[PDB]
Enzyme design. Sequence first.
Site, short mmCIF file in Angstrom:
data_model
loop_
_atom_site.label_atom_id
_atom_site.label_comp_id
_atom_site.label_asym_id
_atom_site.label_seq_id
_atom_site.Cartn_x
_atom_site.Cartn_y
_atom_site.Cartn_z
N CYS A 268 -48.57 2.11 -25.79
CA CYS A 268 -49.23 1.47 -24.65
C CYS A 268 -50.11 2.47 -23.88
O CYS A 268 -51.22 2.13 -23.46
CB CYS A 268 -48.20 0.79 -23.72
SG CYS A 268 -46.89 1.99 -23.16
N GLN B 24 -50.91 -3.62 -29.89
CA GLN B 24 -50.31 -2.35 -30.31
C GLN B 24 -49.07 -2.46 -31.21
O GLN B 24 -48.63 -1.47 -31.79
CB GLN B 24 -49.94 -1.53 -29.07
CG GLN B 24 -48.81 -2.24 -28.34
CD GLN B 24 -48.25 -1.32 -27.28
OE1 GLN B 24 -48.83 -1.17 -26.21
NE2 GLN B 24 -47.13 -0.69 -27.59
N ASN C 101 -54.00 -6.13 -20.98
CA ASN C 101 -52.78 -5.72 -21.67
C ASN C 101 -53.16 -5.32 -23.09
O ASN C 101 -54.34 -5.30 -23.45
CB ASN C 101 -51.76 -6.86 -21.71
CG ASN C 101 -50.36 -6.29 -21.79
OD1 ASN C 101 -50.15 -5.19 -22.32
ND2 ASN C 101 -49.39 -7.03 -21.26
N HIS D 111 -44.48 0.87 -18.48
CA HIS D 111 -45.51 0.31 -19.35
C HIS D 111 -46.91 0.68 -18.87
O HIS D 111 -47.17 0.67 -17.67
CB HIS D 111 -45.34 -1.21 -19.42
CG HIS D 111 -46.24 -1.79 -20.47
ND1 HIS D 111 -46.21 -1.37 -21.78
CD2 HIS D 111 -47.15 -2.79 -20.41
CE1 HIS D 111 -47.07 -2.09 -22.48
NE2 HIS D 111 -47.65 -2.95 -21.67
C1 LIG Z 1 -45.04 1.26 -23.49
O1 LIG Z 1 -44.70 0.60 -22.36
C2 LIG Z 1 -44.88 2.74 -23.55
C3 LIG Z 1 -43.84 3.05 -24.65
C4 LIG Z 1 -42.42 3.13 -24.05
C5 LIG Z 1 -41.48 3.71 -25.10
C6 LIG Z 1 -40.41 4.59 -24.42
N1 LIG Z 1 -44.35 3.18 -22.30
C7 LIG Z 1 -44.68 4.39 -21.78
O2 LIG Z 1 -45.33 5.21 -22.44
O3 LIG Z 1 -44.30 4.68 -20.54
C8 LIG Z 1 -44.91 5.83 -19.99
C9 LIG Z 1 -43.79 6.70 -19.40
C10 LIG Z 1 -43.02 7.33 -20.52
N2 LIG Z 1 -41.93 6.76 -21.12
N3 LIG Z 1 -41.53 7.54 -22.01
C11 LIG Z 1 -42.31 8.65 -21.98
C12 LIG Z 1 -42.10 9.80 -22.79
C13 LIG Z 1 -41.05 9.85 -23.72
C14 LIG Z 1 -40.83 11.02 -24.44
C15 LIG Z 1 -41.66 12.14 -24.22
C16 LIG Z 1 -41.43 13.41 -24.98
F1 LIG Z 1 -40.63 13.17 -26.06
F2 LIG Z 1 -42.62 13.91 -25.40
F3 LIG Z 1 -40.83 14.31 -24.17
C17 LIG Z 1 -42.69 12.08 -23.31
C18 LIG Z 1 -42.92 10.93 -22.60
O4 LIG Z 1 -43.36 8.59 -21.05
C19 LIG Z 1 -45.86 5.40 -18.83
C20 LIG Z 1 -45.05 4.56 -17.81
C21 LIG Z 1 -46.41 6.63 -18.12
C22 LIG Z 1 -47.03 4.57 -19.37
C23 LIG Z 1 -45.28 0.46 -24.80
O5 LIG Z 1 -45.99 0.91 -25.69
N4 LIG Z 1 -44.64 -0.74 -24.96
N5 LIG Z 1 -44.38 -1.21 -26.10
C24 LIG Z 1 -43.50 -0.58 -27.01
C25 LIG Z 1 -43.49 -1.64 -28.18
O6 LIG Z 1 -44.40 -2.70 -27.71
C26 LIG Z 1 -44.83 -2.32 -26.51
O7 LIG Z 1 -45.61 -3.00 -25.85
#
Ligand SMILES: *[C@](=O)([C]([C][C][C][C])[N]C(=O)O[C]([C]C1=NN=C(C2=[C][C]=C(C(F)(F)F)[C]=[C]2)O1)C([C])([C])[C])C(=O)[N]N1[C][C]OC1=O
Length: 214
Positions: free
Chosen positions: A24, A18, A181, A161
């Site tokens: 993720c 990704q 993953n 994550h």
């Molecule tokens: C991930 O681990 C993703 C990206 C994390 C960037 C903050 N993680 C993830 O989605 O976690 C979610 C829970 C979550 N975290 N943030 C949010 C979120 C943020 C903002 C809004 C909004 F603006 F719309 F209101 C909504 C929701 O949700 C969960 C634990 C449920 C999976 C990932 O992609 N890791 N990365 C980033 C770069 O390389 C990676 O591997």
Amino acid sequence: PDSVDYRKKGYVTPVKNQGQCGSCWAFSSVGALEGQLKKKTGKLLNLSPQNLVDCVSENDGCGGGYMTNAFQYVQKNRGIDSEDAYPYVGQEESCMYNPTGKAAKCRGYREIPEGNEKALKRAVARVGPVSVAIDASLTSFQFYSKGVYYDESCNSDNLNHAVLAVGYGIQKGNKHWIIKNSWGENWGNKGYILMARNKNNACGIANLASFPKM
Ligand SMILES: *[C@](=O)([C]([C][C][C][C])[N]C(=O)O[C]([C]C1=NN=C(C2=[C][C]=C(C(F)(F)F)[C]=[C]2)O1)C([C])([C])[C])C(=O)[N]N1[C][C]OC1=O
């Protein structure tokens, strides 16, 4: 037989990478969908996480999101494009869903009872690969390569994550979950990591699990 590996059953697509985009949850979501699609149509194909990243208004694209919001998006939308019809670019863009690229459908979603590994296990066996959230912030996690991952410091309440439970098993007296993953094949073991199963909901593997009803 207390074990199952959907990779061997042909429900799991190759491991994806990704990049830096916080997608993720998108890969995790497509992961579960690819499994139910295989189960239903006998066809195995890559689905579009980019479709989710740009279209799931409830989530934040590269900023993060929930898998259930994603499944719901596909359900209301009555579809999700394949990877090749809507290729992943690693950045949020305007929603370009195309009906002619529709590779799968979705009818809703079920959530495994929070923190219930026994239930999670039942779902993996009965339905197939399940979408799960975990604390993947530890260095031990990111440097995983072999064995059954288990680190006390993992915070089951620090879910940050998204990944995919493609099965479960046991290795030298250590029960585990087989986890897909989205960091390419060069991370972990050919892209996968075995996370402690029944070791007190390690990393909170069962706090936020769900799969799409297909
Ligand atoms: C991930 O681990 C993703 C990206 C994390 C960037 C903050 N993680 C993830 O989605 O976690 C979610 C829970 C979550 N975290 N943030 C949010 C979120 C943020 C903002 C809004 C909004 F603006 F719309 F209101 C909504 C929701 O949700 C969960 C634990 C449920 C999976 C990932 O992609 N890791 N990365 C980033 C770069 O390389 C990676 O591997």
